[PDB]
From a paper:
Recently, we investigated the mechanism of a bacterial DNA polymerase I member isolated from the thermophilic species Geobacillus stearothermophilus, Bst, by X-ray crystallography. Here we follow the reaction pathway of Bst DNA polymerase by time-resolved X-ray crystallography. In contrast to the canonical model where translocation is thought to be the last step in the catalytic cycle, time-lapsed images capturing the order and transition between intermediates demonstrate that translocation precedes phosphodiester bond formation in the mechanism of DNA synthesis. The translocation step appears to follow a push-pull mechanism where the O-O1 loop of the finger subdomain acts as a latch or pawl to facilitate unidirectional movement along the template.
For each time-dependent assay, individual crystals were transferred to an equilibration buffer [0.1 M MES (pH 7.0), 50% (NH4)2SO4, and 2.5% MPD] for 30 min at 294 K. The catalytic cycle was then initiated by transferring the crystals to reaction buffer containing 2’-deoxyadenosine triphosphate (dATP) [equilibration buffer supplemented with dATP]. The datasets acquired at 1, 4, 8, and 120 min (refined to 1.9–2.3 Å) reproducibly yield unique intermediates with high occupancy (>80%). The starting conformation observed at 0 min shows an active site configuration in which Y714 stacks directly over the 3′ end of the primer (position 10, P10) and the unpaired portion of the template strand takes a sharp turn (~90°) at the base of the finger subdomain with the next 5′ base (thymine at template position 5, T5) held outside the active site by a stacking interaction with the side chain of Y719. By 1 min, a small conformational change occurs at the base of the O-helix, leading to an opening of the O-O1 loop connecting the O and O1 helices in the finger subdomain. This movement of the finger subdomain causes the dsDNA duplex to shift ~6 Å to a position where Y714 now stacks directly over the center of the DNA duplex.
Numbering used by the authors: 300 to 876
Amino acid sequence: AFTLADRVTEEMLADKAALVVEVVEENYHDAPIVGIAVVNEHGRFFLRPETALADPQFVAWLGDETKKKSMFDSKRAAVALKWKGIELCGVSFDLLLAAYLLDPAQGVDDVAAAAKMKQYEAVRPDEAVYGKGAKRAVPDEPVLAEHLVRKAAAIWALERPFLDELRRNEQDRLLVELEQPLSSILAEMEFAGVKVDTKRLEQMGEELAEQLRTVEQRIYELAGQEFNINSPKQLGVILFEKLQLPVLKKTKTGYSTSADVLEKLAPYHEIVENILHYRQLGKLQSTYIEGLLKVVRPDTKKVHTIFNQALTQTGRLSSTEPNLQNIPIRLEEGRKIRQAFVPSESDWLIFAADYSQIELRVLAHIAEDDNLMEAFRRDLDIHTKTAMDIFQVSEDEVTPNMRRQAKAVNFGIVYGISDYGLAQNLNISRKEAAEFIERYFESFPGVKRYMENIVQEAKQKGYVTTLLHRRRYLPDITSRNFNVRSFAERMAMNTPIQGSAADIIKKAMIDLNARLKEERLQARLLLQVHDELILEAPKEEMERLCRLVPEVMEQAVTLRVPLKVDYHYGSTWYDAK
DNA sequence: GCGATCACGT
DNA sequence: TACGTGATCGCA
């Protein structure tokens, strides 16, 4: 039983409570709060949001840091409250983040899934209450109130077993001193948003739309007919049946038309390069021009991404609506999209700082490979140095292609692709790709020892850990299916690297946020993109940020090799180059 | 709505 | 044959 409360009472304002501030819209920015549940020592309460959020006592309680609250996904509630001008403070336990740390593979995305991990089932899955997709809807107050109170009661009951297991895992500080403080920082970043120059995007979209119209009609003349170029099935009929082009790779449905195969088909027919060009432009047009414009808020002309802090199995952040971690950078045609991301105030600039090879540096530290550590202590170009060692040549004799291949090997450790994926990366036979790995391991015997030892440790312990004690369980490491086992082995290798790099960037973000307030700067964190932090700040703060930001990021952790940070500022994201 | 394909980032 | 998000198409 619970109290369907008409008025906020003092007993609802205890200094420890499980709190539910329910935002049902997936995108919680400027989104309705549909109800509020409080469970504490005095009872279980349901409050109507129009009532509670108009009560000065309740609002003050929400903002009192000394009034401790346990929640699930507090960032959703905090951001939704920010859009109403209300601060949420004192969240001392976030069940979503706790469950994520305990086992990222469970996919915990509602209270019921977290509660199941502790054999607590007195709460329904959110999707059973709200429905899915089209039929999604807020239910009537009795149904809604019961659900919110049950979620709050679950959070109340589950704090102690989650904290206990975190303590046993040595993840208590990881939760309380890293992920939870980071959650508040992400909330501010999402709420601030990034200003977009929508007229420049529209101008880009106009230039693409005319270039698409031209490549499109060229393709139809080359195909002798019109067809849906965006339809991989139809393009497959044109290329492989009508034009008799050789089939170099298959997919489950039919023949591949990936940029992979197309480049190898270009010498056979004029249409292929035009198809490729059409795919480039259409990717920019559909995903990046039209995609961004769809999610710019016309009130603020900002995009307000949502960082998902409890999703990746490595501890990396992901971001959605829009995903700003895949804005093109590699090709100039697509890099120019970043010119659309501008400072949100006049006479401010974008400041971007990025770790140089943090993943390989983490590997050098974790593997204690003398050669790799020395390379970073010498601040060498790691790809050039790797080519020198693999091919047994001096720096003067590294060709561009030798560096490209060494870079692909290093790439294949940072991500832990298969030797098959290396072979395919370098368009080289699987066997020659294998003697590349072997030459690498004789030049870097500490990395080899690390790969072997971490695989054994994953098998023996059942999981691998990162520098800050994030863990990833790898049950497939004992599998008899070769492909399933190999992937688990690669994850055993890659996760302490990628996850430790993620850990360092998170600590840097926390340290930078504290330092920015210490220094009384107006600079504000806007975006993290895996290895980069992007800020905006008055132009009068650039010079201080050039010293402060790299210092904070480089001192976030002490490794056996230096951390190196490159930084740039400019009038747009593009120009912060 | 779902699976399959493709492609973008780190 | 890292970690993802998202657009499109084709099918029921």
